[PDB]
Design a protein around this nucleic acid. Sequence first.
RNA 1: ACUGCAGGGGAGACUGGAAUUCCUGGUGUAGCGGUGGAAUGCGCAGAUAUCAGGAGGAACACCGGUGGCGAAGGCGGGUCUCUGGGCAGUAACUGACGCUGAGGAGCGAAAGCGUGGGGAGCGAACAGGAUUAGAUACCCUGGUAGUCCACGCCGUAAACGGUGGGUACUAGGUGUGGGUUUCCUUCCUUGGGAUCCGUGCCGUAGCUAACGCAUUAAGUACCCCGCCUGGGGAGUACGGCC
Lengths: 272, 64, 95, 117, 87
Amino acid sequence: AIRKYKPTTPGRRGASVSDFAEITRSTPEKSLVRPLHGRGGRNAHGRITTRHKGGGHKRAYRMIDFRRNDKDGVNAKVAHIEYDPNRTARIALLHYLDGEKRYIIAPNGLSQGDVVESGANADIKPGNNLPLRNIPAGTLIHAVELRPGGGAKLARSAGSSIQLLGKEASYASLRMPSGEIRRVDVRCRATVGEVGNAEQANINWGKAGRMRWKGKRPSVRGVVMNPVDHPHGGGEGKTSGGRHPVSPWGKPEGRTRNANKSSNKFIVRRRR
Amino acid sequence: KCVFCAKKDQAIDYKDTALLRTYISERGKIRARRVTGNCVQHQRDIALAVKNAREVALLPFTSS
Amino acid sequence: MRPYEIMVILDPTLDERTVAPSLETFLNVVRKDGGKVEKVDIWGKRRLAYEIAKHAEGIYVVIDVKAAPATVSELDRQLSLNESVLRTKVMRTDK
Amino acid sequence: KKNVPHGAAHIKSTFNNTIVTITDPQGNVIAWASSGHVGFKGSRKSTPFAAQLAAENAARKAQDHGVRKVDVFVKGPGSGRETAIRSLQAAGLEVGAISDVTPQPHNGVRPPKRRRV
Amino acid sequence: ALTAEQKKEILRSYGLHETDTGSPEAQIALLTKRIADLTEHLKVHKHDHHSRRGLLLLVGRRRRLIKYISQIDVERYRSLIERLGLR
RNA sequence: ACUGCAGGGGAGACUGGAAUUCCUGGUGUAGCGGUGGAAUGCGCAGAUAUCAGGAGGAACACCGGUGGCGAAGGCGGGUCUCUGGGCAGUAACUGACGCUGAGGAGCGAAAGCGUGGGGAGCGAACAGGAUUAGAUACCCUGGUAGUCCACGCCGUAAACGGUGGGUACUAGGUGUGGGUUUCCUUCCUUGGGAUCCGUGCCGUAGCUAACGCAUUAAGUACCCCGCCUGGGGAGUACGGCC
Ligand SMILES: [Mg+2]
Ligand SMILES: [Mg+2]
Ligand SMILES: [Mg+2]
Ligand SMILES: [Mg+2]
Ligand SMILES: [Mg+2]
Ligand SMILES: [Mg+2]
Ligand SMILES: [Mg+2]
Ligand SMILES: [Mg+2]
Ligand SMILES: [Mg+2]
Ligand SMILES: [Mg+2]
Ligand SMILES: [Mg+2]
Ligand SMILES: [Mg+2]
Ligand SMILES: [Mg+2]
Ligand SMILES: [Mg+2]
Ligand SMILES: [Mg+2]
Ligand SMILES: [Mg+2]
Ligand SMILES: [Mg+2]
Ligand SMILES: [Mg+2]
Ligand SMILES: [Mg+2]
Ligand SMILES: [Mg+2]
Ligand SMILES: [Mg+2]
Ligand SMILES: [Mg+2]
Ligand SMILES: [Mg+2]
Ligand SMILES: [Mg+2]
Ligand SMILES: [Mg+2]
Ligand SMILES: [Mg+2]
Ligand SMILES: [Mg+2]
Ligand SMILES: [Mg+2]
Ligand SMILES: [Mg+2]
Ligand SMILES: [Mg+2]
Ligand SMILES: [Mg+2]
Ligand SMILES: [Mg+2]
Ligand SMILES: [Mg+2]
Ligand SMILES: [Mg+2]
Ligand SMILES: [Mg+2]
Ligand SMILES: [Mg+2]
Ligand SMILES: [Zn+2]
């Protein structure tokens, strides 16, 4: 579901786009929209901390319910599948049977008009949210929370999923999309299924301006700089940067995780 | 010489794990066709009853 | 309406009292779709020939249903998610 | 300093070597003296004579931990396979039963290519 | 495909006289049913290359009965194409 | 068309056990591995062995054969859903609708190619050891692409029965796979006789340069198709199409 443009211009010679074949109702819900404004990478002091940000197209925040705590046993109905410019996935408008509207990240295979349950008595279908105590082992899940009731934080980009390995006594083991075997609590909640829109990594953005619309501002290499500006800069012709590779602030490459962080007792195996 | 062609309507069944004690050997393996006297069609039904009865654990895959 | 036959292997830490009311909630998905359930024979405890998920015993139930082709593929989807069930082997009877 | 009255002896007899280990019924090794432990090096380790000295050095060192009767699990396509069961007998062990536990795959993993020697 | 109580309704509409299983009207009628039934088996299951060959034996057999029925009577040919379809 | 029947014929989804490898832990301690003989290598920072638990991928022991299926390439762990073809019997139906098929179109082992997953074992390339006058090899220890999955491309094999398809006829002997049917027939023997369809071996007439083929023809005849015209140069060049 990735359409390829014809080479009519020098800037669409290899470009592609999503087919948008799953989006129904091209406008968002009015009451579930909050404003946003770009920062250009600037913090509260007004300085660039994250480089290469800015430009951009104007956006609006869609309120995504990552909690799903307080509607256990009230069934819902998928009204629409929509677009969301903040995330790489697609969002799904659930009409609950009591009257509240919500958005969730759409799992793969959650066409319009389905029914989504929640709580401990739900069925293991794509879309349902259960505690990890009630999911059988081997099931592909997404949008898993780290702490009980703290909000879904793991595996929620497009295509990503966690495999639930096993449950011992009071902790479940999870394979995460980097290979990182993590052990989390079994009262954490997780949505059954794998996140939809799985083909968007294959999109060849065609021209330079098509990344300026998405917000990415150009990245300049350190080796074409001056030695006051970057540790790699200098050299009369062109160089490799006559030292081992570093950041612009002189930090050597290598492991940057805190060596005795508190969550080391929950990590079985680092990624490869 | 074949029991299942001689005595009619005796259903080879994967539930029946007393008929399938014979036609398998002492090591659990399926007996050959020349040592039991079956025809080709009933050796196929015996060897399908045994493979199913190993999956619902009525017979073992191996034994010593 | 094809004649089927379903063999279920239940967990040995369940008594023979909560077996016929247990799968009765599963066999109501056959009756609400138009099927018929004929013979729900229970063999009881039996020594397994090998260890199925840290168990050496098991309860053998034979279902003998006669339903639509899309409701038996629903019945073993729900049995294989219940924690009481170890194995399932759905077999037809006719040719 | 241990004392277990009944044991199990495992004999792995390959085409290059033999290894005789002796365990308890739970599967915990008492003594393991093989054909290279008894002094040999090279192609001599696969002969039947080095098997009947490997089985003696494991038998009379299992008896210092009190083992008086072993069971025998042999596996491997080796030459020294009967000369290591007969060698446990003439060192002071009652053998009882003899079983063959050669790992026989159900055509799973792919073997290495055949030798053009 | 095409159970014995399903081919009777096709023979009652295209057969000639209440027992006709052999005429080119009753055989193009049954073969157009099996071609249409086997194309749903090829929308799902794209890679069934061995049932798709049985489709081309049925297509080639139906086209020879069309060619025969357009040689012996052109009036039967027109009132059979219009009830099923050409192009 | 009706009635029976045999089968690894195909495609999709879920799923089963043995073993190989790695990981966590217990017991254990000094060798394991490999060969014609050795070394490189692994190990002494606790290997090999041995028992328990777990992760993962690929292949499916026995049945399994001289056997079945498919147009050929090929096809076997189990179950379910959809689906192609063949054989026999009845003689109910249409009434020559048949055969072959230039160009054309589809299918077509393995290696390879593109994008994306997966990666246990094996293993082009490659690295080391050995052998050797040398060893870009055989042998040994490692090991990437690849082998696997989804979707496309490629279009080649000693793709072989080195034997194109249809039909009729021309002694038999003996095994075997799939049906149907009379006799001592229920004295069971699933034995014998008859008949249609496959699959083998042996063999007369007949043919062949010989070897050999021989009712599954390379025999006796008819119909359609592709191909050959001394060996090299060469299934190469040039031109074209993909
Ligand atoms: Mg300020
Ligand atoms: Mg950047
Ligand atoms: Mg400069
Ligand atoms: Mg300058
Ligand atoms: Mg400056
Ligand atoms: Mg500097
Ligand atoms: Mg320079
Ligand atoms: Mg410079
Ligand atoms: Mg059968
Ligand atoms: Mg099949
Ligand atoms: Mg496939
Ligand atoms: Mg295993
Ligand atoms: Mg590994
Ligand atoms: Mg260890
Ligand atoms: Mg080990
Ligand atoms: Mg299969
Ligand atoms: Mg007439
Ligand atoms: Mg033709
Ligand atoms: Mg041609
Ligand atoms: Mg092709
Ligand atoms: Mg290939
Ligand atoms: Mg290449
Ligand atoms: Mg590839
Ligand atoms: Mg790749
Ligand atoms: Mg090698
Ligand atoms: Mg070398
Ligand atoms: Mg050729
Ligand atoms: Mg071939
Ligand atoms: Mg040829
Ligand atoms: Mg001919
Ligand atoms: Mg014949
Ligand atoms: Mg011959
Ligand atoms: Mg000739
Ligand atoms: Mg010439
Ligand atoms: Mg050429
Ligand atoms: Mg050219
Ligand atoms: Zn039989």
